[PDB]
Amino acid sequence: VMTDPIADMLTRIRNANMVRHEKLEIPASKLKREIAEILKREGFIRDVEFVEDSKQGIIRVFLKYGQNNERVITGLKRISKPGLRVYAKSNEVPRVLNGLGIAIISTSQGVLTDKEARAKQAGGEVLAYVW
Amino acid sequence: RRIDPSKLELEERLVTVNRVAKVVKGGRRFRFAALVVVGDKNGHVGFGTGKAQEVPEAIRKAVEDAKKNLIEVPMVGTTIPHEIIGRFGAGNILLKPASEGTGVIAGGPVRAVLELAGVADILSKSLGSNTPINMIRATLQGLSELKRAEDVAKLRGKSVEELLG
Amino acid sequence: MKQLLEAGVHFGHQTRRWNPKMKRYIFTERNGIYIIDLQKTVKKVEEAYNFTKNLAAEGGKILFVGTKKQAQDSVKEEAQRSGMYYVNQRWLGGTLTNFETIQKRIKRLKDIEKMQENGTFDVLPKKEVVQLKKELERLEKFLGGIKDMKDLPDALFIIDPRKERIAVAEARKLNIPIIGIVDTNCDPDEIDVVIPANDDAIRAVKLLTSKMADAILEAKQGEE
Amino acid sequence: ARYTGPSWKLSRRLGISLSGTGKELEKRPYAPGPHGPGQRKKLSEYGLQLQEKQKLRHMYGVNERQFRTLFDKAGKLAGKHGENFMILLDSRLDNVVYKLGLARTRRQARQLVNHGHILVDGSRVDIPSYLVKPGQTIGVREKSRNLSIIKESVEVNNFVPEYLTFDAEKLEGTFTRLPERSELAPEINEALIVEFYSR
RNA sequence: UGGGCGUAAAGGGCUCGCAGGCGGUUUCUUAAGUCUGAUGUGAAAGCCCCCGGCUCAACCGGGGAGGGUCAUUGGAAACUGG
């Protein structure tokens, strides 16, 4: 029953990849907009734009698509989940899908990519992996 | 893909062969079934399932069927670029990148198609059903799944080869 | 290049049978039948025009599939005008895929055609030549289009992909690009160069195959 | 343990003249035993594994546990596995001895080491398996310089390995540098020998 | 980490509900969990790393590494908790 908005947004983007619609809407949160900005930096998605309406919402996300068909992301998963806490020391963080994939790791400094996290040497909760 | 050209001869090493029987009124007709796979050891691999009453006919049908299809099989640093999981027919298989000295590590026929890949090293493990056919179809569906990280980097405008490795 | 006036009577076709995936091609509902968006037709026919213009320089052969009633009548005249090979009635299985067996078929046609005049007649007993003659009559209709081809086509035309979805599946089984008109009940994904327009009308196939045959005759006109 | 059989027959089991290289094989092209006139049958994969390992083994004559020891100790080493493994096999004293041309075959060279004919850094070493540190000298020792067999070995000429150097006038030579894999050309694959020990 | 439960073993007959588990968004605060530095200890031997010594090896030794929901203390506020 709406147990976690972020995992919900992840099944939103994965189903969106499955249905190949140009865009979809999600309810607002700064936690959501920040990591969405991280995906905006990674470039897997073309654009994200919020549209205010009382109270929360509503962000509209535009999926990017390749020049030669093919899904831009071959996989996406949220290792973190309620009822099973997870933690990661700064040196312990995996480099998923080797050099292509990037971690989405919330830290005390904020959400960070695994490269930026390795540079900052800052540990934190691992929100999700995208590849 | 695009397309599937077949312009290079191969030794065409065999992976499996087995007799098969079918009941018919007045007896039991026999037909053989043999799987054979092709690979140039230049990063191209294909598969061929050929059944026939006669063994040369079966292996040659497997040859033409192997000729019918090929896989791009990406290979960065003389090894598969990234780890993958591949279930098929309740036949999962895991593959991982390995150190150059590690050598090829797999089951039989999947080691055969990997030798056809020409790759000098690999981690691999069978899961679920042990039958060779689904192991080959899954391993090669996984090879088809494989793509260079540099290729995906070409697909989008970020930077060439982000993370080191 | 096709003009809008040529599209002026060709608007609309199927309803109820429509595939959702082609909804982008659809403009709006009316009465019952959906109306196709004409501008998108102008774009796809434009790209098809540049593409067909590109094939003529290659010298590549093209197939003209045709099976349906009140549509097959046009492709015959358009093919006789183009000089290109064609299909009059129902497509036979494996004519594209089997290749060599069909080559044996046209070889048999060429053989019996020689049997008509070399003097095979008035030698064999009459019942046998009467049987083989009717068999040749069975040959000429199905093979009248096969007589002009031997190599696998660089591309193939189709009057209705849903009728030919298995043959289209064969061309996809190969690597051959597929030009062809597409209805709302048909799936666009099977055809790399769709032509969203009606086909059940004789004029519907007629004008499109006319503009295509004109583009081919014009592109081939340079020769040299 | 080691030697006790024909050994030449073992090379016949290989089908390859290594080692070698002086085995003729051509004198009896057929495989050893009654089945040799008949066409060869393809070996089972694991049987090909053991055949490959054994094929690498006969040139050295090394014991199973010792060869396995050099193996896993080589694998413990960082870097290329087959390179460190082959150079570990090449680090053995008796291999440097036979490659130095002191003997027609490695086994008698091991016997000459067992006699202690061969000094290391001017010091006698009766153990064939002794590790070869770079820059160490290898000689016939002054007491043993005069022997008909040793001179019979010295009189024969052969091309020197790049990693070693030698002078017959001094009857002495040394291990100048660690061998490259490119320098040696074993008939055996190394990916296959590392393949055998999968676990 | 690393399996399931339509028909192979396997969804409780159904429901009400304590304990328990989980739980929308905005803002501030707290620093429990968490992240990080420093300190104390986690014996030696042994395992691992680089070397030395019994003729090599086993065996033996030098330094380093390794190992705690560990303890003490200074910070980080995004997440979870108050």
D196 touches strand E (CB under 7 A): no
Nucleotides of E under 7 A from a protein CB: 21-27, 33-36, 48-50, 55-57, 75-79
Q: Is the dihedral of CA B69, B62, C156, C165 positive or negative?
A: negative
Experimental method: cryo-EM
CA distance A112 to chain B (A): 14
Interstrand relation of C193-196 and C179-182 (parallel, antiparallel or unpaired): parallel
Resolution of this PDB entry, in A? 5.4
Residue of C nearest to B2 (CA): C175
Amino acid at C170: E
Inter-chain residue contact D194 with B102, CB threshold 8 Å: yes
Rounded CA–C1' distance between A29 and E29, in angstroms: 20
Q: Whole-number Å distance, CA A2 to C1' E18?
A: 25
* Cα–Cα distance for residue pair A111/C216, rounded to 1 Å: 59
Query: Any idea which nucleotide's C1' is nearest the CA of A31?
Result: E78
Mention every residue, 6+ apart, whose C-beta is less than 8 A from residue B33. Answer: B17, B18, B19, B20, B49, B50, B51, B58
Q: Do chains A and B touch (3 or more CB pairs under 8 A)?
A: yes
- Distances in whole angstroms, Cα of residue B79 to Cα of each of A105, B45, C159, C172, D182: 29, 14, 48, 32, 21
Q: What are φ and ψ of residue B24, in 5° steps?
A: -140, 150
Q: Is C100 on the interface with B (CB under 8 A)?
A: no
**Cα D55 from Cα D188, distance rounded (Å):** 7
Q: Is D13 helix (H, G, I), strand (E, B) or coil?
A: helix
Q: Residues 6 or more apart from B47 whose CB is under 8 A from it?
A: B35, B37, B38, B65, B66, B69, B113, B136, B137, B140
Interchain touch D–C (≥3 Cβ pairs closer than 8 Å) = no
Rounded-to-integer distance, Cα B162 and Cα C168, Å: 42
Our measurement of CA D29 to C1' E44, in angstroms, reads 64
Distance CA A18, CA B164 (A): 30
Select from D41, D81, D50, A109 the least CA-distant residue to B101: D81
- B160 CA to chain A: closest CA distance, Å? 10
- Tell me the angle at which helices C202-219 and C72-82 cross, rounded to the nearest 10 degrees: 10
Task: For A51-117, list the strands marked E by DSSP.
Answer: 59-63, 76-77, 102-107, 110-113
Q: Is C195 exposed, middle or buried (0-12, 13-18, 19+ CB in 10 A)?
A: buried
Beta strands A102-107 and A110-113: pairing type?
antiparallel
Q: Is C94 left (phi over 0), alpha (psi -120 to 50) or beta?
A: left
DSSP code for B90: S
Q: Does residue D11 contact residue D56 with C-beta atoms inside 8 Å? A: no
β-bridge partners, A106: A111
* Residues in chain C within 8 Å Cβ distance of B4: 175
Determine the Cα–Cα distance for residues A71 and A65; give it in Å rounded to an integer. Answer: 7
B48, two tokens: 């061929």
Locate the DSSP E strands across chain B. Answer: 14-24, 27-39, 45-52, 84-85, 93-96, 123-126
Residue B89, by phi and psi: left (phi above 0), alpha (psi -120 to 50) or beta? left
DSSP state of B81: S
D-chain residue closest to B102, CA distance: D81
**Rounded to 10 degrees, what is the CA torsion of B5, B10, B15, B18?**
90
Half-sphere exposure of C40 (CA within 13 A, CB side): 16
CB within 8 A of A2, min separation 6: which ones? A8
- Chain gaps in chain C, named by the residue before each (C–N > 2.5 Å): none
Alpha-carbon span A72 to A43, nearest angstrom: 10
Contact between A45 and A63 (Cβ < 8 Å) = yes
- Whole-angstrom Cα distance, residue A48 to residue D132? 66
Buried b (16+ CB within 10 A) or exposed e, D155-172: eeeeeebebbebeeeebb
Chain B CB contacts of D191 under 8 Å are 103-104, 120-121
**Interface A-B: count of C-beta contacts within 8 A:** 46
Distances (CA, A) of C164 to C65, C90, C178: 8, 9, 12
